[PDB]
Design a protein around this ligand. Structure first.
Ligand SMILES: Nc1nc2c(ncn2[C@@H]2O[C@H](COP(=O)(O)OP(=O)(O)OP(=O)(O)O)[C@@H](O)[C@H]2O)c(=O)[nH]1
Ligand SMILES: [Mg+2]
Lengths: 18, 137, 415, 180
């Protein structure tokens, strides 16, 4: 856990835009 | 996908209930992955929708499309920006490559009645990219 | 074009001085303290002084005033930027900025001062890069300083590839005493702590309104960032061409981009406070805190400072939720709340005494400032879309980031 | 927490209480305070300042703060309004021309939002001349019944002899303490 919100994984790029 | 299968009937019922024509904030699931929908994921979703039905031939509406995008984002973590269609008038092609769904006239493009039509060639032919090369960069 | 970068103290003693041009006599510092005393006692004190034809432009540190003398028409902004870079370097090398390190770290301080700027022109300011040629515990300088990439040392290898992001929100609110909000600005700040192997070229992608309009997706929720200020690693040409955010992250925690846009939405916290101040008899504090934020989010450590009378004594607090403490050092009612669910409403009724004798001078009305910090809540609605981690060797990165929403200039004007 | 020590102290009496002594000059306030404390009529010059003393009676420390009625000391009554629980009004029925001024002073002092818990205590002083009125004519002239949320009680006390002081003290004790 961590104060201020749990860290979330990010994507690599806009997969929906090619 | 059991969750997707379960949400498909309720989502279809909600879309049908909404006619073809309160809480603030943007809560985010903790640790929930968020990323744009992928071509393979879009193709799988289109195939599942075609198999289960409810979207093919359904009248295209802003409320129904928004509800479907919100349900997809909730159940998978895909941003609701990949369900875009090319501007009219005429057949609207999906903006995201891989989506087999498109809007076709049923009769100003904003007043033309459109319905969702399955198209397997969209997952291989980038109609939206060819039509709008600037929109794809 | 500074002439001599010196380090002063709280008593007027020059802790450390390092002349860069020699055009100003070293005895001119003795007049800085009397000049500052004269300026502060007449309301004309300024960070940039003037001793005859010599100007003393400096900022105030925790315990020292970083004064830098000059004589010509030097760029004061350049001097301020050099002072800020020096302060950041001192903070990165020494965990504290006080007199205990100036008299103890003179061996490395002189080397850092000599290497940082020559003839009044700073040449190297990267603390991570500077930590490779000047140490307090010397080889040839690294090629990163000579190379174009002066913010990411080559050859860095880690067992894992973890990049932790921090989307920290800054809610600044300027509510007038009439009840309307004047200045309501949100300043985004993406602070990442990169730990990767090699020299990766991150390709950050968000849900920008301009990017969505250019792609043709200007219909979903997109952040309308009025001002976007990227770090030195971010290539300006790529962002200007097609809003492409491509830059090599450094090794450690740093500020990549700092968004800043206005907000026309209702405040997350609504503070309805009243003052039933009897003349020299007593006063009442009918303070009501309405949380307009989403009920799914919880604002950890809610601290709404309520400026009570400076001569208030014998205080009593009739509140609903949260500990209420009166701090006589700050002269305010610290409405401290640990957890405040969205949509909650805490009511407080203060009552304190007042001396019969009236005060000699006016005290002013400090504004009520809340200290809300709601994690996992993005008010601007900006969501990170992708982060293209590309490496020549080739590795599978594991990006991470969290959204923290806090209060910035969240002041409320009193009546 | 435990308050057994408080109960043990209350077994023999714990409450002390306080009291105020205000009014116009030459109202017999100092002589009355001296008789209450000592029991004799002492000769005192006009009170330029004030007199503060205490009275031990009925196990209650009756602290009395005498206040003069000087014109320059009329607006100085607000100094004793802080941390004050009681109030006693001393009228001067022997001064017809000063009765209106005393009533106006009492009304101005009764128009404060800080003194709300202080009950009214009207003391009829100078009860030795035939011109003095009864315990109702003065109250009717001052309109003591028109004091909303004010527990007033008129008591005639003779400065030369001392009759009625004990009844007034008993009434004040009954108004302060609400127990057996
Ligand atoms: N003859 C007679 N005179 C009295 C009696 N009681 C009060 N007085 C007069 O009232 C005056 C008031 O005396 P003090 O009580 O000592 O002073 P005070 O009432 O506090 O008045 P200030 O000191 O001016 O505020 C005295 O000088 C007496 O002359 C009384 O019972 N008989
Ligand atoms: Mg007297």
């Amino acid at each position: 856990d961590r104060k201020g919100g749990s860290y979330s994984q990010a994507a690599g790029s806009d997969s929906a835009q090619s | 996908s059991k969750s997707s299968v379960i949400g498909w009937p309720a989502v279809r019922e909600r879309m049908r209930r909404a006619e073809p024509a309160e809480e603030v904030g943007f809560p985010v699931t903790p640790q929930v992955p968020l990323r744009p929908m992928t071509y393979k994921a879009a193709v799988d979703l289109s195939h599942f929708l075609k198999e289960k039905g409810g979207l093919e031939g359904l009248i295209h509406s802003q409320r129904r499309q928004d509800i479907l995008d919100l349900w997809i984002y909730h159940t998978q973590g895909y941003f609701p920006d990949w369900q875009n269609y090319t501007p009219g008038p005429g057949v609207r092609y999906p903006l995201t490559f891989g989506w087999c769904y498109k809007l076709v006239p049923v009769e100003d493009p904003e007043r033309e009645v459109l319905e969702w039509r399955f198209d397997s060639r969209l997952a291989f032919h980038h109609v939206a990219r060819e039509l709008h090369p600037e929109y794809f960069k | 074009s500074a002439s001599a970068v010196y380090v002063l103290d709280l008593k007027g003693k020059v802790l450390i001085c390092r002349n860069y041009r020699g055009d100003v006599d070293m005895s001119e510092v003795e007049h800085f303290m009397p000049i500052l005393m004269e300026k502060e006692e007449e309301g004309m004190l300024s960070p940039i002084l003037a001793h005859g034809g010599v100007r003393f432009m400096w900022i105030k540190h925790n315990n020292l005033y970083l004064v830098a003398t000059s004589k010509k028409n030097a760029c004061v902004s350049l001097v301020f930027s050099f002072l800020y870079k020096v302060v950041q370097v001192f903070s990165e090398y020494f965990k504290e900025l006080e007199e205990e390190s100036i008299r103890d770290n003179f061996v490395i301080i002189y080397e850092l001062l000599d290497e940082l700027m020559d003839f009044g022109y700073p040449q190297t300011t990267d603390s991570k890069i500077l930590q490779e040629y000047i140490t307090q515990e010397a080889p040839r300088p690294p090629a990163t300083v000579t190379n174009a990439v002066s913010w990411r040392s080559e050859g860095i290898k880690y067992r894992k590839n973890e990049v932790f992001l921090d989307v920290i929100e800054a809610v600044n609110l300027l509510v007038s005493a009439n009840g309307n909000v004047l200045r309501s600005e949100i300043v985004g700040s993406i602070k990442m702590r990169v730990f990767l192997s090699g020299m990766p070229e991150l390709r950050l992608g968000l849900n920008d309104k301009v990017l969505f309009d250019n792609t043709g997706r200007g219909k979903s929720k997109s952040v309308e960032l009025e001002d976007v200020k990227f770090h030195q690693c971010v290539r300006l040409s790529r962002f200007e061409n097609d809003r492409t955010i491509s830059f090599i992250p450094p090794d450690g925690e740093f500020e990549l981009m700092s968004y800043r846009l206005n907000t026309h939405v209702k405040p997350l916290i609504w503070i309805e406070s009243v003052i039933e101040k009897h003349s020299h008899s007593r006063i009442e504090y009918m303070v009501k805190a309405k949380s307009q934020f989403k009920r799914r989010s919880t604002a950890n450590n809610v601290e709404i400072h309520i400026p009570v009378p400076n001569d208030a004594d014998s205080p009593k607090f009739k509140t609903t939720v949260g500990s209420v403490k009166w701090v006589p050092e700050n002269s305010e009612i610290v409405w401290s709340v640990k957890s405040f669910p969205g949509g909650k409403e805490y009511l407080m009724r203060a009552h304190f005494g007042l001396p019969s004798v009236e005060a000699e001078d006016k005290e002013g009305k400090p504004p009520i400032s809340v200290k809300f910090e709601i994690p996992y809540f993005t008010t601007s609605g900006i969501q990170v879309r992708y982060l293209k981690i590309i490496e020549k060797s080739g590795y599978q990165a594991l990006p991470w980031v969290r959204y923290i929403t806090q209060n910035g200039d969240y002041q409320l004007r009193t009546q | 927490g435990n308050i057994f020590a408080n109960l043990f102290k209350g077994l023999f009496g714990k409450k002390e209480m306080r009291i105020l002594m205000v009014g116009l000059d030459a109202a017999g306030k100092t002589t009355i305070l001296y008789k209450l404390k000592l029991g004799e009529i002492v000769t005192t010059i006009p009170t330029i300042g004030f007199n503060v003393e205490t009275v031990e009676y009925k196990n209650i420390s009756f602290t009395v703060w005498d206040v003069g009625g000087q014109d320059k000391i009329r607006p100085l009554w607000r100094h004793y309004f802080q941390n004050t629980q009681g109030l006693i009004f001393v009228v001067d029925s022997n001064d017809r021309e000063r009765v209106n001024e005393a009533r106006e002073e009492l009304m101005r002092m009764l128009a404060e939002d800080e003194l709300r818990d202080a009950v009214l205590l009207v003391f009829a002083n100078k009860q030795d001349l035939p011109n003095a009125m009864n315990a109702a004519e003065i109250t009717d002239k001052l309109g003591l019944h028109s004091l909303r949320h004010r527990n007033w009680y008129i008591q005639a006390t003779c400065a030369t002899s001392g009759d009625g002081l004990y009844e007034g003290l008993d009434w004040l004790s009954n108004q302060l303490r609400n127990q057996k």
